[PDB]
Design a protein around this ligand. Structure first.
Ligand code: HEC
Ligand code: HEC
Ligand code: HEC
Ligand code: HEC
Ligand code: HEC
Ligand code: HEC
Ligand code: HEC
Ligand code: HEC
Ligand code: HEC
Ligand code: HEC
Ligand code: CA
Ligand code: CA
Ligand code: Y1
Ligand code: Y1
Ligand code: Y1
Ligand code: Y1
Ligand code: Y1
Lengths: 471, 471
């Protein structure tokens, strides 16, 4: 048994676990070191065109330390600027994979209630970032999935549930609670008081399997669309960090190497074994993350990973360039009078091209986790995009614009203009929200004892639209 | 020293080495077991369209045992039906990587003389198949490259020559004498008698490096073309088994694992070590070919290789389908009156698309030797093909055929009709050659003592156009 077999008071606050596990708490806190904000829309402006008419065309950055998960959720322009708990563009489900306060609230008010309402609804309740409670039982300290949608997805795909899995499988599944592709399913329900409500439930599109093509069939079967493209009016699908799904198909995943083996390597000290809880780049600690299975220079192995990244970039730039052009060319055809009937097949091609290309790049480590599937996906997506473009030349010709040249979108500025994103406006509105409602959320959370100010140190010095210098 | 330190009389005939190395001779002879003839034009008819106007549109099969190299060189419809030593479509250079009689002749008449004349020129001299003398010194039995063009290529690419390489590197370089991409360079020269002659010299296009793109630049710089496409009139480049080049970039090649490690695995018997000389499929002998470095079931490793093959096939079919359509669409535009100026960019795209796609599939083991580069190449080639097709829609439109649909080529029969290949005629002509001149070559070679009839057992029972049943 543990030294807290009856549970931990204030379990959602990771600092409450420090008295029992100071070592893991210390390394866990170190993800604060990974504070870099890489603006992906600035690096890859083609993505802005791909996501026109969707929040990702406003703000999308690369992943950084777990220490910043909650704050980045708050800072991203995607969550907008609510003025109260009933406003703002996004739903409560956006907190789900950002805080240990999520299982706390679910276990208190029920899953459906948690998934009901606006993101702003829990602003002063969900205030702790990725913590001990998101992965451990507060009585046995054993690994556990705290979100019901994971087992639901696992079963649907023919996988064993978390409780039925081996220890090694759990070392990856705890990560899969969040590092997977998902979509919000509108769900009607009635509470204990008989009131009719509507929830937006996190759902893993795994009922037909976890391959990109199986998920695609899944979405097409239910005629689902995350949004209607702002330029091409295509019924679009958004892929979001399908880290585990692509990992499972890669060679390491097939060989049984878990997420933890590389991202949370062991350190043996006598008869005691410790897991590095500073979840980050395995390449910064290869001696413990890689060289325990591979025998050769760290530099050579690093060069090999670099090679994979370059190959992925090569195909990614081609795919998204043609996807961007297809969107713009479809928009031009619409402007000339092309009918939905004339553009139906074209739009289906675009939908599939981007779904496959996005699924390939949305998981930032996929180029390494499953190198070959990533390249194949990008090649498949590009082919769908070009099939659309070949058909588009004919539609453009019918309307007298066969020589139309889709405008360029080589910079974030030019791309956002094409996507009609008024950044200045969104940023100004965001800052006002942060200076008012956000500070009230934090003040109230601290007053109620849900938030410890110590956890806020250097947590809000950077975003894609401001940098106080160094976190 | 060896037991034949002064050399071996009749060294070109591998049977002459059996008295010294009966074990290696026995396994070497066993490649006779790999007698399967897989007609690649039947399996992948798109290749016929790709090679229209070139010999490969007539006959192209997958590789089989070394035991059949010489006979397949004779049987392929590509070498045609010469009636004497001055006729036939191909040059003497076609014998180069098929027989130990090649170094014998080169060392006797000089490199330039060997490379001068028709293939039929040496019909009764080059009669032994891949033998001991192609890879070993007949005095020390040490590994050696017997062809000057390899070191020439190695140096040109910044690599060390064969003699300057390590033993492990030599275990792969001996294979590189033949398993590489090449082209025939027309070379003017004058013999000892002052006579002016023209030779077609095997040349490795490695002066700019060994990557597909570097070789492409190499060919473009000298405005080289293997042939003018029979349908699109595009200046084409033919890739031929760039096995070593792609292998060198793969992870195994980067890690120092030689061709021999998998294809000629060791067998330890006490203090003596033997190399399996039955060069074939490593998957048929995984315990010795793979499991000496990898630790897991043979089936799982086999399934993984199968997965790579399927991914490669997926992208290959897409690439060659668009390449085929581009060729046909260009041919249609020509028929309508399109000028060379209007088709110049299109043709450059096609040339590059096929060069990259062919380089990816010409090496039959590349899907495994360098999985990721193969997928990237096929994706790159496909993109070039689609760029050509998008431009072709516009040219077709200018000439009133925007709705043109390139004919299908899903069967070898239909593809060869589009490529205007009269198979019946070529086969009939070939059989007459085999029944007359070929039998004379073999009779004379046997009379002169250059050929041992024992080596002909079951060697000519199959081809792509006949099957006496079982070799
Ligand atoms: C949900 C509760 C999560 C769980 C459980 C795990 N991760 Fe996570 N991870 C999550 C978020 C929301 C983020 C983004 C953080 C931000 O503010 O940008 C991340 C990020 C990572 C990263 C990147 C770290 C970096 O320095 O860039 C990695 C490598 C990562 N996460 C890995 C990972 C693994 C291996 C997990 C299981 C052991 C794991 N995460 C769980 C959300 C969640
Ligand atoms: C779990 C199933 C998640 C849900 C539901 C949402 N997010 Fe998420 N988010 C999750 C992970 C594992 C990661 C890291 C890996 C990655 O590729 O991003 C993230 C990261 C973010 C970030 C930082 C990166 C960025 O996009 O700028 C933000 C700002 C973020 N997530 C916001 C966010 C919102 C608004 C959501 C609702 C639509 C949302 N996430 C849901 C996991 C999950
Ligand atoms: C999920 C993303 C995790 C978070 C957040 C935290 N821990 Fe963790 N922990 C996780 C894994 C995958 C593992 C390895 C499991 C295994 O048996 O291999 C661990 C392990 C521990 C342990 C056991 C000893 C060790 O391996 O170091 C302890 C005591 C532990 N974790 C404590 C702990 C605390 C206090 C955390 C918050 C500060 C915490 N963990 C977060 C995954 C995750
Ligand atoms: C042991 C548990 C492992 C750890 C930790 C890492 N790798 Fe690994 N790797 C492992 C296996 C069993 C395999 C399958 C092939 C084999 O050797 O049997 C691999 C394979 C790779 C590869 C090649 C596959 C590819 O993607 O092309 C690479 C380049 C590789 N591994 C790199 C690598 C790095 C950089 C790691 C640390 C971050 C790492 N591996 C950890 C087993 C294990
Ligand atoms: C070792 C063999 C690994 C396994 C198993 C998993 N990951 Fe990984 N991951 C690894 C590397 C070498 C990299 C690339 C690092 C680089 O900078 O080149 C990654 C990357 C990620 C990322 C991207 C983080 C970022 O870009 O900021 C994430 C989010 C990530 N990995 C998550 C993750 C999860 C959840 C895994 C299991 C499903 C997983 N990784 C396994 C190495 C290894
Ligand atoms: C030229 C003199 C060669 C040398 C030296 C090596 N190979 Fe070869 N190989 C060559 C030819 C002309 C052929 C085609 C044979 C035919 O009639 O189709 C081949 C074929 C192979 C194969 C395929 C065998 C099968 O059963 O399908 C392999 C796997 C192969 N060769 C490998 C190989 C290796 C590893 C070498 C060096 C040790 C090697 N070959 C040398 C011509 C020549
Ligand atoms: C060495 C540099 C070569 C030259 C020059 C030529 N060939 Fe070849 N050939 C070589 C190898 C290594 C292989 C096996 C690997 C492969 O992918 O094919 C071959 C195989 C053949 C075959 C059998 C397969 C087929 O194409 O049906 C034939 C019939 C053949 N080679 C014929 C041939 C001719 C006519 C050549 C002159 C143009 C020629 N080869 C040159 C290596 C080399
Ligand atoms: C080239 C394609 C080869 C042909 C044809 C033959 N041999 Fe070979 N042989 C080759 C290699 C790559 C190796 C291994 C070299 C090493 O040191 O690792 C060998 C080795 C031998 C040896 C040494 C002992 C052994 O490893 O078995 C002998 C005595 C030998 N080869 C003899 C031999 C004979 C008699 C051949 C013709 C019948 C023959 N080899 C062909 C490559 C090639
Ligand atoms: C030892 C000399 C090896 C032999 C013989 C074979 N492989 Fe190998 N393999 C080896 C290394 C050092 C690596 C690099 C990665 C690592 O584990 O350190 C590999 C890698 C692979 C891979 C993964 C890479 C990829 O292509 O995705 C696979 C799938 C693999 N090896 C398969 C394999 C098979 C089937 C072999 C026999 C025919 C084989 N390898 C031999 C080292 C060695
Ligand atoms: C092990 C790690 C290998 C190394 C090193 C090399 N080859 Fe290989 N080769 C290997 C496999 C697993 C395969 C595929 C077998 C299958 O049927 O799936 C191949 C295949 C080839 C081929 C194709 C033969 C055919 O299709 O008939 C050739 C011609 C070949 N390999 C040649 C070859 C050469 C010359 C190498 C060094 C440059 C080489 N291989 C290395 C495994 C391994
Ligand atoms: Ca989604
Ligand atoms: Ca060539
Ligand atoms: Y406490
Ligand atoms: Y990062
Ligand atoms: Y690979
Ligand atoms: Y003798
Ligand atoms: Y074969």
């Amino acid at each position: 048994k543990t030294a807290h077999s009856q549970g931990i008071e204030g379990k959602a606050m990771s600092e409450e676990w420090a008295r029992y596990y100071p070592r893991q708490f210390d390394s866990w806190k170190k993800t604060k070191e990974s504070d870099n904000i890489t603006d992906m829309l600035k690096e890859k402006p083609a993505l802005v065109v791909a996501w026109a008419g969707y929040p990702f065309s406003k703000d999308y950055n690369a992943p950084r330390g777990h220490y910043y998960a909650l704050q980045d959720n708050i800072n991203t322009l995607r969550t907008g600027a609510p003025v109260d708990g009933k406003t703002g563009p996004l739903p409560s489900a956006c907190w789900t994979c950002k805080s240990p306060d999520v299982p706390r609230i679910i276990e208190q008010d029920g899953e459906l209630e948690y998934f009901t309402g606006k993101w702003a609804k829990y602003g002063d309740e969900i205030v702790n970032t990725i913590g001990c409670y998101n992965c451990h039982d507060d009585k046995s300290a054993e690994l556990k999935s705290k979100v019901p949608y994971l087992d639901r997805g696992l079963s649907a795909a023919g996988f064993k549930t978390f409780a039925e899995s081996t220890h090694q499988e759990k070392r990856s599944l705890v990560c899969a609670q969040c590092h997977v592709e998902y979509y919000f399913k509108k769900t009607e329900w009635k509470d204990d008081k008989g009131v009719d409500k509507t929830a937006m439930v996190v759902t893993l599109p795994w009922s037909k399997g976890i391959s990109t093509e199986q998920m695609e069939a899944y979405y097409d079967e239910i005629n689902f669309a995350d949004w209607t493209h702002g330029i091409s009016k295509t019924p679009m699908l958004k892929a979001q960090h399908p880290d585990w799904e692509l990992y499972k198909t890669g060679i390491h995943g097939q060989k049984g190497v878990s997420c933890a083996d590389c991202h949370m390597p062991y350190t043996q000290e006598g008869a005691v074994k410790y897991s590095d809880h500073k979840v980050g780049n395995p390449l910064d600690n290869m001696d413990k993350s890689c060289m325990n299975c591979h025998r050769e220079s760290e530099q050579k192995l690093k060069d090999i990973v670099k090679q994979k990244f370059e190959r992925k970039e090569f195909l990614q730039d081609i795919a998204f360039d043609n996807i961007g052009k297809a969107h713009l060319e479809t928009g031009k055809a619409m402007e000339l009078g092309a009918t939905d009937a004339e553009l139906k097949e074209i739009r289906t091609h675009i939908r599939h091209a981007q779904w496959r290309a996005d699924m390939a790049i949305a998981g930032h480590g996929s180029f390494f986790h499953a190198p070959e599937e990533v390249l194949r996906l990008l090649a498949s997506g590009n082919e769908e995009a070009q099939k659309a473009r070949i058909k588009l030349v004919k539609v453009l010709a019918k309307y007298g614009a066969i020589d139309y040249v889709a405008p360029d979108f080589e910079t974030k500025e030019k791309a956002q203009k094409l996507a009609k994103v008024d950044m200045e406006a969104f940023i100004a509105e965001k800052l006002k929200f942060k200076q008012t409602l956000e500070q009230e959320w934090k003040k109230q959370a601290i007053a109620k004892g849900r938030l410890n100010p110590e956890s806020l140190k250097g947590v809000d010095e950077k975003s894609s639209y401001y940098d106080k210098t160094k976190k």
